[PDB]
Amino acid sequence: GAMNSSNYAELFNNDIKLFVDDTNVYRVTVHKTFEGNVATKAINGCIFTLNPKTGHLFLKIIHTSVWAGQKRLSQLAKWKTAEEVSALVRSLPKEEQPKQIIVTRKAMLDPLEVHMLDFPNIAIRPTELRLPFSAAMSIDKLSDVVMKATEPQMVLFNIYDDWLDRISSYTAFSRLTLLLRALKTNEESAKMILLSDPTITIKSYHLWPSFTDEQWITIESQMRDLILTEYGRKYNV
């Protein structure tokens, strides 16, 4: 069934599962043409496939050449996404294939379902959670590798860095989702928060600053404060 607040700890049991998010697969700029009509230019995108228990990220880069001469691109992008998910599963050793894939948007159910007909025992699931994974292109290192690519490419990461060495999946996921929620609501402030102190660096093999435990508390509180402030502004509360 659908994933929601009630069955949320299932994410952290030992059943392998992946979240798939397609919000950044087809990315365009919108501009005006010499004649004054509107036109789009596509930029590179990505699929955000993530194992919430282990932090492993299957960043499938979607090159703009994919779209050349195609119509109904926003529709194609769902199927292209399902295709790349299926191929990734097929690429994995059997014991590593997921038992579940959770699509963060309901319109992916049918394309994935169809592409996974070879995998009838992988359960394709929607979610009622409102996950911030679209803010993934607010993480500087991911945005960069995506925008630089010259071909289709799979770049692998751990989105938790080395956090699990000191905290549980549950906590690591809540941190991730709070950072991205902040990023999504006010990226300028969110990033300010993360980098104000130049003495805290990002390891060349990491995505986020090497905060101490005490410094993560301060950060997470600063991020919470950010998210609440933005809410009053949006709704005049």
Partner: protein, 300 residues
């Protein structure tokens, strides 16, 4: 003109013959239906006055034999049976007509309804859906489930319709996932028409039979089958022009005959709005669309 005699009418029952139906009172002297048009399949169905659940009946064709009805008090129902003694059968049927205890199949001569609803229905195909090969006629009731329903229990009593499933390997060629799911012409034309049904008339036959069982017995799985086969055609970009025109006719007459009051369970909002208005074939069902709008614009 053919006859289906009844031994007796022991319990109060509403008897149907095709789209017609008569109330018959407990031990009212009723002894069959005469003047039944040779040339088509037929269905004689029942609903007991005490149990307005379980409609049941018998598909038959009088070219295949002399059939009669006989209430069974052990099993509690009107049973169809075959009489192999032609002499003995003409004798019962003549004595009953003489005594004039039979209703005449009430066909208006202008009326092509039953032809139109049964055009492609063949007894030989029915008896494959309802496998019971020691009888020439076929029993169906309200509660019989289909083979597809069974898969997601007793197979001796199953409706062996063709299984249609749009999210299946049958339906979707490897590598053409998106194309085949959005345009089912492959599935319709190669898999079903050429592959399984062999021709369009057998397809339309099962569609019509599926409708009819939904209409007469409220068979839910029959209703599901009927819509599947409509949707399959209406979700295919490439359909023979002769099928499109025949479908529009088939459907018109089915919508025309449905009881007005039943349009809520027998008609699938999604499929119909999809076929009439979203599908490739939106523009290809002008009579079905005209009649749906003027008669059930609420569903739409």
């Amino acid at each position: 003109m053919n006859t289906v005699p009844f031994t007796s009418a022991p319990i109060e029952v509403t008897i149907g013959i095709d789209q017609y139906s008569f109330n018959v009172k407990e031990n009212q002297p009723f002894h069959g239906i005469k003047d039944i048009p040779i040339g088509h399949v037929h269905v004689i169905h029942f609903q007991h006055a005490d149990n307005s659940s379980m409609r049941y009946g018998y598909w038959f064709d009088c070219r295949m034999g002399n059939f009669y009805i006989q209430y069974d008090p052990k099993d509690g129902l009107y049973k169809m049976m075959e009489e192999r003694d032609g002499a003995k059968f003409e004798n019962i049927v003549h004595n009953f007509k003489e005594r004039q205890m039979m209703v005449s199949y009430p066909k208006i001569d202008e009326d092509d309804t039953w032809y139109n609803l049964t055009e492609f229905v063949q007894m030989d195909k029915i008896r494959k859906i309802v496998r019971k090969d020691e009888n020439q006629f076929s029993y169906v009731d309200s509660s019989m489930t289909t083979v597809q329903e069974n898969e997601l229990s007793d197979p001796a009593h199953s409706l062996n319709y063709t299984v249609i499933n749009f999210k299946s390997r049958e339906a979707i060629r490897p590598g053409h996932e998106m194309e085949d799911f959005l345009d089912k012409s492959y599935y319709l034309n190669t898999v079903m028409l050429q592959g399984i049904f062999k021709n369009s008339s057998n397809y339309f036959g099962e569609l019509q039979f599926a409708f009819l069982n939904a209409m007469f017995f409220g068979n839910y799985g029959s209703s599901l089958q009927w819509h599947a086969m409509i949707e399959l055609i209406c979700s295919s970009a490439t359909v023979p022009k002769h099928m499109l025109d025949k479908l529009d006719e088939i459907l018109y007459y089915q919508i025309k005959t449905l009881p007005e009051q039943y349009s809520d369970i027998l008609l699938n909002e999604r499929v119909w709005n999809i076929c009439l208005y979203s599908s490739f074939q939106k523009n290809s069902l002008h009579n079905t669309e005209k009649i749906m709008e003027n008669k059930y614009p609420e569903l739409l």
